[PDB]
Amino acid sequence: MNYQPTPEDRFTFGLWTVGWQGRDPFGDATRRALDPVESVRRLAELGAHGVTFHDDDLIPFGSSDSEREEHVKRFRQALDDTGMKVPMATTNLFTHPVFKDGGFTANDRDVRRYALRKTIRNIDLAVELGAETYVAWGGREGAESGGAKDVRDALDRMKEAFDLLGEYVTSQGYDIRFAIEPKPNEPRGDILLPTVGHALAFIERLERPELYGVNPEVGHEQMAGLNFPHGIAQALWAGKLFHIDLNGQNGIKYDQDLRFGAGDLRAAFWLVDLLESAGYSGPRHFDFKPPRTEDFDGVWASAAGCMRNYLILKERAAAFRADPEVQEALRASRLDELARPTAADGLQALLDDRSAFEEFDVDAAAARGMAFERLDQLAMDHLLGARG
Template sequence: MEDQERFVPQPEDRFTFGLWTVGNRGRDPFGDAVRPTIAPTTIVRELSRLGAYGVTLHDNDLVPIDATPAERDRIVREFKAALDDHHLAVPMVTVNLFYDPVFKDGALTSAAPAVRRFAVDKAKRAMDLGHELGATIFVLWGGREGAEVDAAKDPRDALRWYRESLNELTDHIIRNGYPMRIALEPKPNEPRSDIYLPTVGSMLAFIQTLDHAERVGVNPEVAHAKMAGLNPVHEVAQAIDQQKLFHIDLNDQRIARFDQDLRFGSDDLKGTFYLVKLLEDSGYDGPRHFDAHPYRTEDIEGVWQFARGSMRSYLAYREKVRRFHQDGEIQAVLARIQKLHSEGPAIDGEASLNWWRERGYAYEELDQLVTELLLGMR
């Protein structure tokens, strides 16, 4: 029982979910919804009961795109009351620039100035909503920022429009005095044939061209990296190295599949362990945000099992990280490897070259020990 109590989520663990995650109704390209809509205020209540820290949202997850100003104010007022009643925070908001048909050829990279204007203004209103709810992170996923027909749009123009739009959005933050930063979310695949700025590395390079690069970072997602066969741990490490990990989306994914958004840690146990280890060892103090969906097979009760399982899994992996650092045999092997690397001879001739050529690094032994740790053998 004592062991199980370590895996009970608490607000200080900073676990968050999007309204669109637990609220996902199971619709996919080949089948309609299998669950009823869950009201945002109900989601707030249930996540609080499960021990979450906060909830996040796209603008239209909460306020319909066609809501009148009076309807918008009523919805927001009721939502804020639920947040207060259940002691939940809203650390991040984002904007939906991908669903409406107006964005079919891009939002911030649309060749049409009228569409770009509409997209930027919509994003500004989402920022205003986020500030009203207390959010300090604004995530921007460029889901429609891409192309199928390269003859139709010069990618240099698209990047210039992207840059101009982001500069205007950071100006909006600064002009209004919002304590808010922007986190760009890369995704190599879907829904366009080719996506602009598809990886963490390409986003980081682009950020350096912005007027206020210090206000813009990245929001890596596990599934997005794995869809393209990339290593999420390395993607996140690059963001940390550049001090640009402003937010993170946690889920799971099988390599080269469609965007599965599986429950965190449910598929790749070793990869998830190393990701949690990286976050914990680096001192990342932002939200642990679960951007995943319950299986389409589930009813409403299954939705809450999904949310509970996501948080418990993170806590279990975090416990494995603690045991990794305390395991005497693992640490002895690491020390032996590090000593070999640091105390081996300088390369100044054939004899020293051969010394390095003949050495084994004991990585098989280390990897097996980590595997045994994850399998509960240690």
């Protein structure tokens, strides 16, 4: 069994992932900076499909227009030399001290206008480079204390910001959609739109909701103790899974951003099963941090492992679903019945149906086991490659 990725697998990486220098709240960098060109080349050699960037990863904050142009031209040449694509881009509205109280929801109105202008400039660049999705991660939108932020006013400001961005895109005629990335906390004590559900709900209040989806990250929903495959199912059900960030997280703690497959391994299996069976066709993007224990050899080993673990889990999920004994077990657990309408006959027929209440044998129904444990042990056996 080997598991070599190819660009057709649509694996992508942010520049800031393999380029993370290892600075954490308690320690200095353990690695030197990587030139974006070198990252593109190394990732292409590993079998990646593409890369993504924040404005500030590519063009140093404060660069002159002429320095701007040269950074972009070198990057473009790297993409041309390797066949790598740029499917997604985003804005850094969190590192510079001016964003210490947020970008779109900063209390200072002048900061909010600046955040919008910085964003628009990068949307134009994203379109130029061929990106299809523009992510917004409002990492500084939130508060450490209750009186610092009136959340209804802040949501008004957030809606206003996204509405203006949609006006811009439509007026310019750009073929790009937005994806909001939720996170419950860190670096703010609580972040606005903390989960996939809150982001989905917010989108429905925007002026042009069809332009907006979610970019969920495995570790972020897990920082709220939530079931990531369930949240992705809800996003797929809503037609809003525009992009996805893959990584690993061990429970409720700081955002670890481990390589994909690390952290909750069974959740990774059910996630891949869901993405492949739903036919999600977008990038498989890894937003991860090689641990700061590693040198550059360990950075590339960690990046390769992201892709490797996806392909192993893809093979095991596929074998699970194709196994005749598993298909029989799904029927024994009535997954087929779950998929049938409860009352296609309609309300009136349901009300008139004595077998649904008056004559329903609740005791006999209650006695039926669901057979879920046998089903779940077949899933475990498939995951571990122990089928017998």
